[PDB]
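Exercise 7. Given the components listed, write out the predicted structure of the assembled complex. Treat all entries as one system.
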Amino acid sequence: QNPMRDLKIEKLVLNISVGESGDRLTRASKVLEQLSGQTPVQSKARYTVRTFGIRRNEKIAVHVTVRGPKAEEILERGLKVKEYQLRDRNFSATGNFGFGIDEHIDLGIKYDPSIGIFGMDFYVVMNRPGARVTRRKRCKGTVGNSHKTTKEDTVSWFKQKYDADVLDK
Amino acid sequence: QKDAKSSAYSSRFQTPFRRRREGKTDYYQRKRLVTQHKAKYNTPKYRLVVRFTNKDIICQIISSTITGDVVLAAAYSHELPRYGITHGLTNWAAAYATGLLIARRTLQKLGLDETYKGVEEVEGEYELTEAVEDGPRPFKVFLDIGLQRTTTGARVFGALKGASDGGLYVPHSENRFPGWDFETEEIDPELLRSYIFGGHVSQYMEELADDDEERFSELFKGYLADDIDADSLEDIYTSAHEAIRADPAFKPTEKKFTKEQYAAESKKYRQTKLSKEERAARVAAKIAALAGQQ
Amino acid sequence: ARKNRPRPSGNEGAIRDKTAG
Amino acid sequence: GKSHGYRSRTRYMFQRDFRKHGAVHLSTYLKVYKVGDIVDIKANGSIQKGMPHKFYQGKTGVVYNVTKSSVGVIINKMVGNRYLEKRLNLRVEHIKHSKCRQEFLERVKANAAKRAEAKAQGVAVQLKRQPAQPRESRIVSTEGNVPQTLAPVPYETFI
RNA sequence: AAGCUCGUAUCAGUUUUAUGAGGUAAAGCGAAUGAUUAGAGGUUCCGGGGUCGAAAUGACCUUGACCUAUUCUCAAACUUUAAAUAUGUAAGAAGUCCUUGUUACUUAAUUGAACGUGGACAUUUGAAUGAAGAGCUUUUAGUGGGCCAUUUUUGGUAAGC
RNA sequence: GAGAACAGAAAUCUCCAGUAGAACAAAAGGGUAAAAGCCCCCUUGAUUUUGAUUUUCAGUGUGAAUACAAACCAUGAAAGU
RNA sequence: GGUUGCGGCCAUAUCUACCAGAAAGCACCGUUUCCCGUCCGAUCAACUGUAGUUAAGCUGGUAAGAGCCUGACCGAGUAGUGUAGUGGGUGACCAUACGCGAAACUCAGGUGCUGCAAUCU
Ligand SMILES: [Mg+2]
Ligand SMILES: [Mg+2]
Ligand SMILES: [Mg+2]
Ligand SMILES: [Mg+2]
Ligand SMILES: [Mg+2]
Ligand SMILES: [Mg+2]
Ligand SMILES: [Mg+2]
Ligand SMILES: [Mg+2]
Ligand SMILES: [Mg+2]
Ligand SMILES: [Mg+2]
Ligand SMILES: [Mg+2]
Ligand SMILES: [Mg+2]
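Answer.
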């Protein structure tokens, strides 16, 4: 039936792939903590490509995870920017999804020219409760087949709440 | 389609033993535990194992043999009502109580209880059960925490303190007990004594009760129902300790039924296997119906 | 590479590729 | 040029098994070894410490020493025109009782019990074993089993 | 060569019984690695294209790839499996059982360990066959270019290599 | 494999599959999955005293290695190492 | 018989897709003052056992299921091989005598057992 299989948000991950190290990386870092109330983390580049101008381990991007009520309200504050209007092919085949935006100042931080103007990529991890089965240490196990998330489940949920719409396909 | 693993893969798969599949026992731990100095031929190594399940605590004394492991004695949490404890059967003090119980139980059944009395005037101090002069050189046993993660003040080490204060000689340092100062290497005996006697809940009563009555109601509801005051909490633990030191004899339950009755009910209740003749008839019928043009 | 992979608008690539002052 | 290391030409000898890699089941360490036990040697490639040299692969000897985690063994090696006794030190992993004695003692105890119970009536217990005696005379009937006649087979290519 | 200590044995280029170890012969590739011929079915938001098209995450053919099930053939430095022949150990008195002495070792513990005291069990005392005696010590001559035959086998076309 | 702005065959993030098809200084071969792999914390047992044993072997040496003994240590809660 | 803790043997115990599961137990499950760790009480820490649910985990069954295990005069006394001849053949190689003896293949059957301790309509 449907006693407690209710879908819910795990985590909002906030990503910025600023292509270079140094000051503009530092400023990128100084963007998120205001938005997140939370300190960010920096990821290194794991092999040179020499066309994007990157070396091994020269620390390119910044991303954060947020969960719970603060995560859902910030999600809402992003979907307001995107006017509740998302394309089907954005959705993961597992039931995850995500999108991107530009001009982070179009929400929250006014301009603060010392910081600059940056775009982000939000990505949402979605599931049902009872998920710690795959995450605890003792007696680790996988989730049942019927109990996973799906394209259809997540799009239907996204329909019914936020009363939003999905595009062409 | 995608969720399809090849026949070759299935036929070359290795399997973990059984407990690794179940994610239950760390054989790398069991290695360092159960091996005996080969010069000491049959003298078995004894493990005080501790396990924390939801709403219950288990502690046991085990030696190991080829045909299986064998247990000297066991101590569950859920019989502490026999010793005057009715709530919070998973708190760190509950673990201490269980350790004390198992300690005195084993010593009583082994005939060591008169000697190695243990410690009565508990003070949160760190000391080992030293060997009595020219005596029987007290019993020795080592921890077995399983996969449970070690960390400062973890409630398993309450069981360690229970065994130690009971009198078992259990080799251990103290730098993980709650209140082990970190930036400087000392221990706060009185804070430890607080966690022994339920400080973290006795104190926690006050802020919540003077702060948030509905929250103080939903949890600790049983405390209100059975009329326990915060200050009195230390008293019941102290009285328990004497109750254990009085009688650890492990009265077992009476089961109000029979082994056979339980087996019969579950047997008649359970679903059964299907036999080969019926399997053949089943496939034949499936042919004659679905394949047989319905 | 695809046949039409990044093919821009004439009036949108002017603010895309200028690469010098 | 030529080459003779400590572990040369062991590439197959020391491979573990098929489908048996990984840690070792505890029974091996749960064994207990007394001085005077007769023991076989089979190397175990998983534990590089205290291995036996390839020459002592598959051999059999008598234990003579016991230490915290290993065993002293005596082997007789044929070098030149004599035998020399070598003493080995092996971790308990490459070691297992040769149940030859395990069964032999069974025979001995059963033998003594048989001797005693036979002496209880003085009836010449007759201890020694015998090789396979030639089988005895016997009669074969044909009831419902009439002899069946064969014949050699002709030839064809069978393809 | 000189002997020495003893007199049917603590033996044996041997078989049997019991129990180990091995990766060669063989075999396998619709089993890992690697090689290899052929069609068959799908699959391109994705290869190269052409045809219909202004393009389309539009259609048709083509080539290629990729995947699926099949098919033909191989390995000294591949392998699931796995021989015969060769090979380790045991088949008793230096044994087995019973009782209880010693220790600074070890055990929670007279528990264990090791060595003993004392007692019990003989020619069927622990498979086969043989045993021309068995065991032990010195000391010193010659020798340190080899060759051939069956079988296994390496380089080379081969050779009386 | 499936998704996320610039971002594309390749940057960063997330999920699913994953018996090792990777890594382990170097040649190859063994061995390794709550590790022998990757990351983090503490340290110097890469110490002292001389023996015993294995490999090449004359049962010499050298090299390398193994198992104890007697101290002082490091680590871990601990067994251990 | 069910369940839990500790196991032995390490797939007859794994994998793929479905279906059922009383009681208890296990579990998911609620909270962040304190010990404690995190980019984030997700993991780990602590407290309650109170607010709920067997949906999942787990157990069992189901499949002319993959796999896996066992057996067989199924293949085969074949392949291979120890020993012998003044045996055959120019040779490559092959029969013969006394011996040992595979794998693939085919068919049939099977799909965890079990020790210690506690608890369960
Ligand atoms: Mg560990
Ligand atoms: Mg082998
Ligand atoms: Mg070879
Ligand atoms: Mg061949
Ligand atoms: Mg083959
Ligand atoms: Mg191959
Ligand atoms: Mg042999
Ligand atoms: Mg001379
Ligand atoms: Mg010469
Ligand atoms: Mg580790
Ligand atoms: Mg040497
Ligand atoms: Mg001849």
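Discussion: The radius of gyration of chain C is 10 Å. Chains C and A do not touch (no CB pair under 8 Å).
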